[PDB]
Amino acid sequence: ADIKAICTEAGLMALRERRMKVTNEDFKKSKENVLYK
Amino acid sequence: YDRGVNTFSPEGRLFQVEYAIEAIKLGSTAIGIQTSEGVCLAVEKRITSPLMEPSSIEKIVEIDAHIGCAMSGLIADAKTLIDKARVETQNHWFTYNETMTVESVTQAVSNLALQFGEEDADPGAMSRPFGVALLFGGVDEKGPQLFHMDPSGTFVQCDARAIGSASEGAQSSLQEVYHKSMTLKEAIKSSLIILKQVMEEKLNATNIELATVQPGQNFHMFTKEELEEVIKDI
């Protein structure tokens, strides 16, 4: 579930920047989003 | 839980004592036979892996030069009883210059059982009964003698007693094959036969322990060659 949430949130960050290619920065923000806070 | 260790059931049973008695049925099968030629103790090692060294599975213990013990159930619990037997013995020798009676050793070990409690107890007092059953076998003024002890502290002399997981079937076979006037070799062979038909594994000179206490001679643990000599028949 954590991995799927990481992927979904990284895709959401890519969507925020109007991108179709998910970058490593998107996944980095995803980890601090779903796992923390 | 809510119940204490020293609690009586409505039927008059000490709850923890019965629960410790139920622990023996998970232990390995031991068979002791008393005959005019001596006392034969046998036990199954129940090896759980080829890597485990059989020689480290010590389930028949030299209590003294004239007394041995075979334990079944929680072997770790039996260490305290064995140590008390081996210390209580040589204390009779220290004060009276004589070896203890097998009955006296068994009684001294029995007094340890039921010496457990929660409140109003010494800091070194135990918290639960000893979940082990002991088979003392020795030679004294009364000749060879075999005594059975259970976690309730009830020790009783037995002509041929089987404890452990297969206590029921092994006891039935002992009743079928035991007669009072038989040799020690016959006793050893019969005990090995009864063990072989109740082991989960196949009987060999490595997964069983055999010991004998004969009049005149001392306590003797059977070696691999001696075990193979009697196993080669059955």
């Binding site: 980890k31 601090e32 796992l35 923390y36 806070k37 | 809510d2 204490g4 409140e119």
Partner: protein, 236 residues
């Protein structure tokens, strides 16, 4: 008696010690505490939760205590249990690992027998070479280069894992890292000096110096960090 006994020092059916886990949960709600090791010193940066405007400032430090002439410690969890553990730490005190081992032996003994609740306190030890240690209520301790306990400890540990260049740090770089991590862990977007507590242990003239940074120095560190972050923003 048996009815009212909660049986703190027992095993759960899964093999866990529920009281120890609950004490760790309690520490998870405590103030954020950071420990960073460098080549010339160690530092402890604890988030100050006693930030009320009417709280008098008389103590040398709030969560950072001095155990001996060579060691300092910081606590996260129940503050009174922390006081008990620190007093026992001073009584026991010596090499850092030996002191941590003794205190952890006491903490473990509290989780094995006695029936009392465990000490719901996690400790970060800094001492002199330079070494940083972390101890849990279970009595399980471990050495670290950079570590965090308390609130948002996981995020701080991840940030250190990503940013802590092993071996190549002085005290200045370690302090900058401490401010950078504490900025993200704490919810305050500014992180004023009055809500943090930094103490550095360094070897000077063959003696151990444990000094809590003055509020002016902490403000300077925060200003430098925010200026560096603004410089990074200049790139975007």
């Amino acid at each position: 008696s048996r009815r009212y006994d909660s049986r703190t020092t027992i095993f759960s059916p899964e093999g866990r010690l529920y009281q120890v886990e609950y004490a760790m949960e309690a520490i998870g709600h405590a103030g954020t505490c950071l420990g960073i090791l460098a080549n010339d010193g160690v530092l402890l940066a604890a988030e100050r939760r006693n930030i009320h405007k009417l709280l008098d400032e008389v103590f040398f430090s709030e969560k950072i205590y001095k155990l001996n002439e060579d060691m300092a410690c910081s606590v996260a969890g129940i503050t009174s249990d922390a006081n008990v553990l620190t007093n026992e730490l001073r009584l026991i005190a010596i090499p850092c690992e030996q002191l941590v081992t003794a205190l952890c032996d006491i903490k473990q003994a509290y989780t094995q027998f006695g029936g009392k609740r465990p000490f719901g306190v996690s400790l970060l030890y800094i001492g002199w070479g330079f070494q940083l240690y972390q101890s849990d209520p279970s009595g399980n301790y471990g050495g670290w280069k950079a570590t965090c306990i308390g609130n948002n400890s996981a995020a701080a540990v991840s940030m250190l894992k990503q940013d802590y260049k092993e071996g190549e740090m002085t005290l200045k770089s370690a302090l900058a890292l401490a401010i950078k991590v504490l900025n993200k862990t704490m919810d305050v977007s500014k992180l004023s000096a009055e809500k943090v507590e930094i103490a550095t242990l360094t070897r000077e003239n063959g003696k151990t110096v444990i000094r809590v940074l003055k509020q002016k120095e902490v403000e300077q560190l925060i200003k430098k960090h925010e200026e560096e972050e603004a410089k990074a923003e200049r790139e975007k």
